[PDB]
Write a structure and sequence with these properties.
This protein is of the alpha/beta class. It folds into 3 domains: 122 residues, Winged helix-like DNA-binding domain superfamily/Winged helix DNA-binding domain (Arc Repressor Mutant, subunit A), CATH 1.10.10; 69 residues, no CATH class; 179 residues, Vaccinia Virus protein VP39 (Rossmann fold, 3-Layer(aba) Sandwich). Helices cover 49% and strands 14% of the residues. Helix 15 links the parallel strand 7 and strand 8. The structure holds S-adenosylmethionine. It is classed as biosynthetic protein. The entry lists the keywords biosynthetic protein.
Length: 390
């Protein structure tokens, strides 16, 4: 009733902008919710099946260099595309038609094809096309394998390095997800490039005031400022310190697995001044004691509650009474949004989960900590949960 009226107004409005950053996303959500309302189950399942055929056509046409063979502007015949890529024109045509019917491609006349704004990213190698490939190659098989997986392993939340849904779907339940993706650096390459999209997002500086850390940096000129626990390449630490002279990158500690820390070293320019580099295992005792801030960003969602309590317990033991622990993770609403529920199930294929603030509270308290506050990013659920010793 009412929601149809609301969306209908957001439809009239955006029709004259054709002739507002929140305005785009209030309309994409309303269109989805309206679609769900008008739709009955039979239309739902036809829509679902169409999504699977569409991603399959996307995957094949990328793989076969068809999007490359279509000029970014102007038209080209199906015959000319098929000769360029050396493929049966009938098969090119049937798969292209899927994307024409869904608006990803545009057909001109009876025999010519052209790119749209929605298909051009697939014409080259980049984070978006890497995400498409990874979704199809690394997540869909695991999803389709979940019915058999839960009959095989029991119908409970899956956790643990071995016997992931992913490894089960690959025929190799004994191997870890790292071993699987590392045994074909072409696969690792698409995984790495795809994660480049979301490495920029949700910057910690500007969302969290570190002035209070500056005052600590002066009042104690010796103590470690910010320890980035599992910080990968240390980009979060860099952004924090970049143009803050009172927060010196040289006073911070980047921690990760020794193989990751070694790669950080081997890819730094000579005089580039960096934080301290420390290879370690955060399932073990925290080597740096009494830092002002411990940061653990996008690590806890990979693990069970019990493993998270062990990880956080090591940080709490190493923290001082005035220390702060910052957990950077999605905080699910109850119920969660569409993209975070989707990521929650994707994480289940590799032994992880997303969590509500209640689930984080249980884990944090078990580690001898307490939640002092939460800074949530605007327009999403990614947050920094500020914790202190209990
Ligand atoms: C999802 S990445 C997060 C990287 C970074 N914090 C960020 O926000 O982008 C998880 C990181 O944890 C590291 N890691 C995994 N297991 C670890 C362990 N046992 N000890 C230390 N680091 C670990 C990985 O090497 C990886 O850099």
């Amino acid at each position: 009733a009412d929601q149809l009226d609301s969306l209908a107004a957001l439809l009239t409005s955006r029709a004259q902008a054709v002739r507002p950053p929140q305005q785009h996303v209030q309309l994409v959500k309303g269109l989805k919710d309206a679609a769900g309302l008008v739709n009955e189950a039979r239309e739902d399942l036809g829509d679902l099946m169409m999504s699977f055929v569409q991603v399959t056509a996307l995957r094949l046409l990328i793989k076969w260099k068809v999007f490359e063979a279509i000029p970014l502007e102007g038209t080209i015949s199906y015959a000319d595309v098929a000769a360029r890529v050396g493929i049966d024109v009938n098969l090119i045509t049937r798969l292209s038609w899927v994307l024409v019917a869904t608006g990803v491609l545009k057909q001109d006349g009876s025999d010519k094809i052209q790119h749209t704004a929605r298909s051009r990213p697939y014409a080259s190698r980049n984070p978006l096309s890497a995400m498409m490939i990874i979704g199809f190659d690394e997540y869909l098989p695991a999803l389709l394998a979940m019915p058999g997986y839960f009959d095989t392993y029991g119908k409970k939340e899956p956790f643990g390095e071995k016997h992931t849904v992913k490894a089960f779907s690959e025929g190799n339940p004994e191997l870890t997800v790292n071993q699987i993706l590392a045994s074909s650096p072409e696969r690792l390459g698409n995984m790495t490039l795809a994660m480049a999209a979301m490495e920029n997002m949700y910057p910690l500086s500007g969302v969290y005031d570190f002035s209070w850390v500056a005052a600590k940096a002066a009042s104690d000129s010796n103590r470690p400022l910010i320890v980035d626990v599992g910080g990968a390449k240390g980009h979060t630490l860099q952004a924090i310190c970049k143009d803050t002279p009172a927060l010196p990158i040289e006073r911070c500690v980047l921690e990760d697995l020794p193989r990751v820390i070694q790669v950080v070293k081997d890819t730094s320019d000579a005089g580039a001044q960096a934080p301290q580099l420390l290879g370690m295992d955060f399932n073990q005792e925290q080597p740096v004691k009494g830092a002002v801030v411990y940061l653990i960003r996008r690590c806890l969602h990979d693990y069970s509650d019990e493993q998270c309590v062990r990880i956080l317990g090591h940080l709490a033991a190493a923290m001082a009474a005035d220390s702060v622990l910052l957990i950077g993770e999605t905080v699910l609403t109850n119920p969660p949004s569409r993209p975070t529920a989707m990521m929650d199930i994707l994480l289940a294929t590799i032994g992880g989960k997303e969590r509500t603030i209640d689930a984080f509270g249980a884990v944090v308290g078990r580690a001898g900590l307490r939640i002092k506050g939460v800074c949530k990013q605007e327009g999403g659920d990614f947050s920094y949960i500020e914790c202190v010793k209990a």
